[PDB]
Design an enzyme around this catalytic site. Sequence first.
Site, PDB file in Angstrom:
ATOM      1  N   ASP A  76     -43.796  -7.670 -34.937  1.00 27.74           N
ATOM      2  CA  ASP A  76     -44.516  -8.963 -35.089  1.00 27.74           C
ATOM      3  C   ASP A  76     -45.978  -8.811 -34.668  1.00 27.74           C
ATOM      4  O   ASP A  76     -46.357  -9.132 -33.560  1.00 27.74           O
ATOM      5  CB  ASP A  76     -43.782  -9.950 -34.177  1.00 27.74           C
ATOM      6  N   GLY A  77     -46.798  -8.333 -35.556  1.00 22.89           N
ATOM      7  CA  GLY A  77     -48.242  -8.158 -35.230  1.00 22.89           C
ATOM      8  C   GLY A  77     -48.386  -7.599 -33.816  1.00 22.89           C
ATOM      9  O   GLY A  77     -47.478  -6.987 -33.288  1.00 22.89           O
ATOM     10  N   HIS A  97     -38.049   1.850 -30.528  1.00 23.25           N
ATOM     11  CA  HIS A  97     -38.640   1.289 -31.774  1.00 23.25           C
ATOM     12  C   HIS A  97     -39.913   0.502 -31.450  1.00 23.25           C
ATOM     13  O   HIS A  97     -39.891  -0.436 -30.680  1.00 23.25           O
ATOM     14  CB  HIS A  97     -37.567   0.354 -32.325  1.00 23.25           C
ATOM     15  N   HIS A 119     -43.367   5.472 -22.056  1.00 27.07           N
ATOM     16  CA  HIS A 119     -42.915   4.173 -21.494  1.00 27.07           C
ATOM     17  C   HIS A 119     -41.637   3.714 -22.205  1.00 27.07           C
ATOM     18  O   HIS A 119     -40.636   3.417 -21.580  1.00 27.07           O
ATOM     19  CB  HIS A 119     -44.088   3.243 -21.775  1.00 27.07           C
ATOM     20  N   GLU A 120     -41.660   3.674 -23.508  1.00 31.66           N
ATOM     21  CA  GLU A 120     -40.450   3.257 -24.259  1.00 31.66           C
ATOM     22  C   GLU A 120     -39.296   4.192 -23.901  1.00 31.66           C
ATOM     23  O   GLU A 120     -38.245   3.759 -23.475  1.00 31.66           O
ATOM     24  CB  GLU A 120     -40.834   3.388 -25.736  1.00 31.66           C
ATOM     25  N   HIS A 123     -37.686   3.653 -20.874  1.00 28.12           N
ATOM     26  CA  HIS A 123     -36.739   2.499 -20.933  1.00 28.12           C
ATOM     27  C   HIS A 123     -35.478   2.882 -21.715  1.00 28.12           C
ATOM     28  O   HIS A 123     -34.398   2.982 -21.166  1.00 28.12           O
ATOM     29  CB  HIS A 123     -37.499   1.405 -21.678  1.00 28.12           C
ATOM     30  N   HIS A 129     -35.898  -1.983 -16.601  1.00 31.69           N
ATOM     31  CA  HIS A 129     -37.293  -1.750 -16.119  1.00 31.69           C
ATOM     32  C   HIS A 129     -37.271  -1.193 -14.695  1.00 31.69           C
ATOM     33  O   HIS A 129     -36.225  -0.967 -14.121  1.00 31.69           O
ATOM     34  CB  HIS A 129     -37.970  -3.124 -16.128  1.00 31.69           C
ATOM     35  N   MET A 137     -43.886   0.696 -16.907  1.00 41.12           N
ATOM     36  CA  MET A 137     -42.795  -0.160 -17.457  1.00 41.12           C
ATOM     37  C   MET A 137     -43.305  -1.581 -17.736  1.00 41.12           C
ATOM     38  O   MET A 137     -42.877  -2.231 -18.667  1.00 41.12           O
ATOM     39  CB  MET A 137     -41.732  -0.193 -16.359  1.00 41.12           C
TER      40      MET A 137
END
Length: 171
Positions: A76-77, A97, A119-120, A123, A129, A137
């Site tokens: 979303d933008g 993603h 970072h992703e 997670h 987190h 995070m």
Amino acid sequence: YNVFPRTLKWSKMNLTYRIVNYTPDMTHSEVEKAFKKAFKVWSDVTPLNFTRLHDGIADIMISFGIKEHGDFYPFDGPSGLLAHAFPPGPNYGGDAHFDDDETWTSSSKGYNLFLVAAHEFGHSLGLDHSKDPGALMFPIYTYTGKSHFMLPDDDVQGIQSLYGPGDEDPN
Ligand SMILES: COc1ccc(S(=O)(=O)N(Cc2cccnc2)[C@@H](C(=O)NO)C(C)C)cc1
Ligand SMILES: [Ca+2]
Ligand SMILES: [Ca+2]
Ligand SMILES: [Zn+2]
Ligand SMILES: [Zn+2]
């Protein structure tokens, strides 16, 4: 022994993953750094075992997400959502993603996969987190994976201690 469901760091000292961030403004070479390099930093903070067995044995992966779940709309933008990761359970766990509507790169401009991806992945493979005070995070990333120092020690030592040695042993 139950309170805040945020840790998932115990029986997972080793796991597999796939590299496929995207090819927007970067090339196979950059994505190679984004996924690898970002992994080099993640390993620097913690000796996590990671293997990309293309054979089809991967748990987490770096890739631009494109609305394909069926529940909430991640992409979303530039909205507050650049990287959503899932729990390493089924074949959709540790699924890193990025809001396909966002921007990603390996240069001094925008989110550096080293940072966003580290970072992703932190997670998707780590857990909900772990940066109440300051870690890679929070929704803020400003300091790239290595554009100053491990300010986000929370994620550095945090997983360096929790994801370090795995248990996977019921007493
Ligand atoms: C490098 O540090 C960061 C990595 C990823 C993000 S994010 O993808 O923008 N985003 C943070 C966030 C945005 C809006 C609201 N709440 C959080 C992700 C995230 O936390 N990824 O680990 C959200 C969508 C879960 C920000 C900084
Ligand atoms: Ca977004
Ligand atoms: Ca998966
Ligand atoms: Zn997704
Ligand atoms: Zn986060």
